[model samples]
Target: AGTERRAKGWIQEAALRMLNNNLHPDVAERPDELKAARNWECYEAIVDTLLRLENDETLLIQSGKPVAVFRTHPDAPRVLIANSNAGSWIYIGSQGIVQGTYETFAEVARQHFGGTLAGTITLTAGLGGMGGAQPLAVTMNGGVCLAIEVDPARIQRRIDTNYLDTMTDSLDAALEMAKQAKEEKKALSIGLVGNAAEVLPRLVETGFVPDVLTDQTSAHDPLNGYIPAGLTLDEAAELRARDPKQYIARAKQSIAAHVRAMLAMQKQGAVTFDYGNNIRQVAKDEGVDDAFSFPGFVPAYIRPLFCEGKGPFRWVALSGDPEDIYKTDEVILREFSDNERLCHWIRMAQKRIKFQGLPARICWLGYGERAKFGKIINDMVAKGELKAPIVIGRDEGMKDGSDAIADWPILNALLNAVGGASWVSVHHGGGVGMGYSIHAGMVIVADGTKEAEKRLERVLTTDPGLGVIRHADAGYELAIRTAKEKGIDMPML
Candidate 1:
């Protein structure tokens, strides 16, 4: 708010106190309003210009399928609102990648660049869309499942807002409800979006707290910001170009403040680096934002890449059980475990502050043939609650007749008929002390055979405006990866 309140889309008239490619000294306390300004000032004209090109046949193409109408249908449109709850677990960290927006765009080819490259040949390489919902909406292949963890009410919300009051007593309740819906042949997808938004503030506060949670579910201490050790701008730009809708100016924001603080502590041999758990403490005790916040300095620890792997590998995994079989919450939590140096500092909090520190956690799981997944509906079914399943359609096997998933039967029908898979979560932390740090990350691996081949290529972190890089890569290969349904909707074509 201090500087000229500039925003993206207004590059031409921008006062240009640009800090990095992403951040400018023009502190925009009112990002929403500034965004509105950018739209009116820049985007509208761009749209008009593009449309003109379309009229002149300069634009690529156009289409109208899925629905009889080619344009907007306000009345009686097929409005299917699939629940997307298995989106996050544990700390959402900085990256809150949108589930609906991207998938919606993907669903209706026109959603992205006026094409339907999402349904048949989707982003996934090996895994089939559990139902024929393919390539969009629920990537984990929509299914009903269960899980346990601490309620998010304790932490996650910014301490400033009354976020704690919004905690849910039953994470299981939501999961069961989703399962029931799935049973009814509905497009029921469970996601962890709510929980992710909950933990941001705490991650901004404390560095570590390991008492009630497992070693793998927390974050490093002193809040060093979310940046890999050594990185450059070129790599940053690659991440940015991939998702302009979300990741704006990622190449900037180096998160090394807490680490530097630790360095300073050791300089004089101060027994330990105790960056307290609160904004005031970090600013006062840890001297955050004072020395760092420089050209390449990022205060936040991680910007999770929602899809975590390259073309043929696992791009993302939720934090949960049996480790990396379905989605590796095991490895994600291992980040917390890996930071054992800070784990020592995390485990020492009191009960009240306990949830405040590292309390509750949840992990997302996908269902398919022979996935290491357990009796997903058992938890919800056992409760004898009203359940439903969003059934897109029915099938028996892959169109190719190849064994899609050697084991699962329900999947055999779904994959052949309507193509789908369920996305759900299991609790890891969040039921503990005050709660865990918002400083979180998504874990990804190459694959079973290539696990050894994959080397630690790079790690990225984010700052305030740099747009957190959450999760990447469509990593899970149900071993039945098929073409995403970018089906050529001809006739109209």
Candidate 2:
């Protein structure tokens, strides 16, 4: 197939087996597999590059509906890395980076282990935080890869108070898959992002303990709960010693328990501290999981929101500025040199095509500046790099942009850019996402392909999720009909 990510005679096993030590016990004995992978030296270079670059937007991979872990053409014996360098890239948002983000990952793999990789670099994102990329990959590939879903069960546990719920789920899912790989005897190492490596321990701790007690922000709000402000362990101990009366008095009640928790957390450096020790364990965690598994791989990264936008040498090559806003090191921690290579690779991958669509004028409705990502929407718009003009946050956008549609006003953008204005049954406009919002199916409907009736299946190409989500037929038909009867222009960006 491609480069030997796994050991000899192990292709039949699931890719997850390659990384799960639980299933495959002999993986640790095979030094050759690691050696072979090491031969693909670019791996560490890529890692180092990511580390150095403090910020690189393009370096990020979207979601993966159908990941090409190790694909082979049906008739061919050769393993393929995945082929996406044939079409234009569609920029997605919210659940943005889907399988769409991997055009580059596939490219990087192909570059090192050159061969016949098939399929377009696809994009798949978790919807409403419900459906996710891992589950989608499993569904799309028919159990070819282990399905590592962000444990909604686990995530749901923290929905009330854990802001890191999404981040936690991402790591936990990858680690869970790795554990599965260990049992399978595959020789693959997952290159994780951020604490993706330490997902196991964090999950373990969360299971045993929990995120800091919820500091209920609102008393009147639903799910309103609160954790009292407590002392730093240092402060609490000093208080216990210095102000024994007050400390003891407070201890007799709920506030005392909070103080104890704070002190305990402070001792562990968790209270008034970041999850530092937990992160150091990621690589070790991944290594342990993959040690006894089959030939597999687990590569994960962690980058927080408001990440530095894309640019050349965009990683934290120099010492990172101590910014409290994001957790930086857990991402692709590469130096400037490595940053250049990775960024170059990412930009090159961005150029690859995964869809049959063109860069048409896409008018987005129902959002405002808050939701609009400047780098993607605004920056791209400013530079004319991409063509998606978004109008958001207007709920009832009536053509005139009059009185700023209160909710998400983007509908006005749609009307102004591509004039087909007539109100029909919103349900008639069957499409992906909210009817009033910009969705793939809606765009396709508005596109009004002459054979839309026959080629409505074409809508699937735009958003496969839409099919599972909403039939979107009403919106589709309405948009088409309105364009027809109301004289909505076709192919007008």
Candidate 3:
């Protein structure tokens, strides 16, 4: 790796590298056209502005285009980005979501299956970006997974990446494989290529219920996310191109049918939960009044972790070296050795997760732990123990049914900006789709400098600290207790 600066400073250079990293062939789904307004004109302008930006200047990106650079103090974030259905951050491919998915299934097991999914079957749908993690995550917990995905290409991608074991287009064959695996108590993942709207109802009609069930289809964006039943993928695409409104109506109708099947499966004793794709809301709007019968995964399984300020904290090695990431893995193993679960996750990830671009690692680190790890990483860089600087970042969420509230993410972006993060992003309609959820992303560089250390300390603390304060403000007793124990200065508490 060349240790030269294309930008004036490492902070500015970080923004440049991360933006390019987001478009790397291994990272983005389509490097040439990454949806939204990612054409070369917009990209070139942003790159030019970032390279020319001064230390006391801040670049403003609105709706995926670099609009202006304003004079600001050196302590402010060098870059501020806001987008709709677009994000500018380090993405580590499917591995990015694997740990979170693993944690979710692990929680489900703890709650219902005596702390393991061994001898059980998990049935879910969707094998795109976020949903692709479901199959590997289920098998990681020692369960058999039957994931129904309409796109054959997506299923093949997962299998090629080792995120899925095998795939089939036949419903009967998939069911038989899952049944055999479940009976033998073997860990396996099967990707079934079929629209969930049709397949789920078919399973219900066949009187088949899984030990656990969920859906991950992008039912949030009906027009682009879900496909109507009985239509081939090509027909769905053609209809969508011809009549957008008709496509949306048909997608919503199919979503209603899908929810009905999920509800029926729940009644028949399948452990069902909404995987936060907002499919239930779409079904409810489509006149399925009982669409909310099952609970959301956040409130049901992830709230306790959020209350402790724990979320997906990830880092990328700027040197493009897998060994750099491996060294950090060793750091985690040695420092948090007592955290068996965390260590086990790191080990499993090292073995199973293939880096898509710029070797990166992600694990759920909470309040004090994040700050501690941040310092250690900076120290490693200072001591020449690492090949290059690291970019640390995280994803945010909420509990207590406050998911749609935009205030928390706004505050998070503002706080990180004030704390001198390298780059901060405020996104609208991120995970659950446009208009459904708002969240922020934060990335800071640890370049082995004392200034970098101070910034890391402030941003890392403020980042996850918001999670604890948010849950506490939502009247969660666990959050309140955590705040008091951590001396977080909550006056009301």
Candidate 4:
């Protein structure tokens, strides 16, 4: 579409930094943690990062080691470089984004909240990478959030990033602020400092309940993730090293107490759910039989979306122009005229979403529908309909080749592949943590009226229907029911 040209020095530096972030060892998930990558994405990531690092001035001062960043000068006249793995081809910059805690909160905000979250107050903890996304997601739906975190640094990070509005050390103070926001129907996020095991129970005792409740503490790693109550982060870390067994023991006890408090809150009319950090299992192991009294957010919400190859589809305008995203927002609304839900998001996002570095936008798009929008944007680029092109990229417990994904998603993806898509992966048992969940990722180029779109329609429709038929016949009743004999009790159904 253009004459040969060279990338700006900053652009190359940016690409290199992005590459480094993905391979920081601490950033990348364990090899097995992302089974989809084990096949291809893993090795590709290393090469992707290293090869870019060599020529760029991407400096590093990690652990005190120093290096410079990209020093490339401006050059002219070059062709755009690209390719398709379409023997059949597939892609995304990485695979780790799928099948993780981050995707869980996404499902909650979109599937659970929809349009009802406004004016409600939701509370949660952890505020880690995925946890951090929660407050913003809730607020985007016009809900108030009282986010809890024991780590001072984590709280500051969220606030500095504008994902949080204020921080408080007092429960009464936090509750009062939330009440005002709730009454006013203002979307706000307040960061509270303290151990969740301690703070939540205290709230229960005080009878100060939130409209919605959940947690994202690093409870997945019992030995280190969950901190012991009445202990600071420093003391807890030291204890973890000094007496690993005793440390996990205290952690489990705290988790048990926390689950009990959440149950109390649930009883008082709060909508509670586990944010998929594995705290329920820890409490269950610690002798709370009904620790799982509240279901995981996934089963409670994400299942139905997976059945339709539907998920949280997102894109970023690397150009850092707000208008670039606005234009695309305009396109989504215009093209998907029948989708009122998408129209709502596009409208809200334009007003509420802010640019962090490169401006980004996200919304849900499914199967045949996803292809339609993707094609529209790509074709728009060719026709000078907007600014620069965007990056395209969902869920665990889908049928998508990972235990993190569940049945419906894997089936959803396969339907796309069989119908002539590219780059599909499925995890059978474990991808997110240590559990049997399924999930996947896929790419199919679409046009308003062309090959990929036609194929996309036939396959997408059949695949979703197939998933529905399979689950319906199998009776995937994930919910627990306490019932009396049919002779004595009325049939609920």
TM-score of each: 0.19, 0.19, 0.86, 0.68
The residue-by-residue lDDT of candidate 4 on 1-493, one tens digit each, is 1122123322333333333333344434543343222234433553343345432233222211122234431221001111111110111222222223324544555655564467689988888877877777677556788988999899999899776789999988999999999999998889999899899999999878888899989999988688878889889999988999989888888888889999999999888898778888888888988887888777676665554445566554544466767877888887776765467557755654544445556666644566566666656655655554444332244343333325566666656555543223343443345446445544332222344345545543454344434433334432111111111122333
In model 4, what is the error at residue 130, expressed in angstroms? Answer: 0.9
Query: Taking the tens digit of each residue's C-alpha lDDT, what string does model 1 give over 1-493?
Result: 1112233211111111111111212222233433211233333442333323211121111110011112322111111111111111112111112222222322233322233221211111001111111112222222221111122321233122321111123434443454444446342322222221122122224432110100001122212222222333355345445754333212111222333433343343222212112222233343355432211101111111112211101221111111122222233333445433122212211111112111122222122111221122122222422121101110011224532232232222222212111111111223355442111112211112121111111111111001111111112222112111112112321
- The residue ranges of model 4 lying beyond 4 angstroms of the native Cα positions read 1-114, 315-325, 335-341, 351-360, 378-382, 386-418, 426-439, 446-473, 476-493
Best by TM-score: 3
User: What lDDT score is found at residue 150 in candidate 3?
Assistant: 92
Rank candidates, TM-score, best first. 3, 4, 2, 1
lDDT of 2 by residue, 1-493 (tens): 1212232221211111211321122323343343212233433332332333221111211121122223222112111111111000122221123232222232223333241112111111112232232322222221112211222442343233321112233545545554444345332222222211122234334642221111111111111111112433355566765866665443333322322333343344221211111211222232333211111111111110001111111111011112210122212223223433333333332332121111111111111211122122323323433222221111121223332222222332223213211110111122456333322112211111222222223221212221211211223342333334433234431
Q: Flag clash pairs in model 3.
A: none
What C-alpha lDDT does candidate 4 achieve relative to the native structure? 0.59
| Candidate 2: RMSD to truth | 24.4
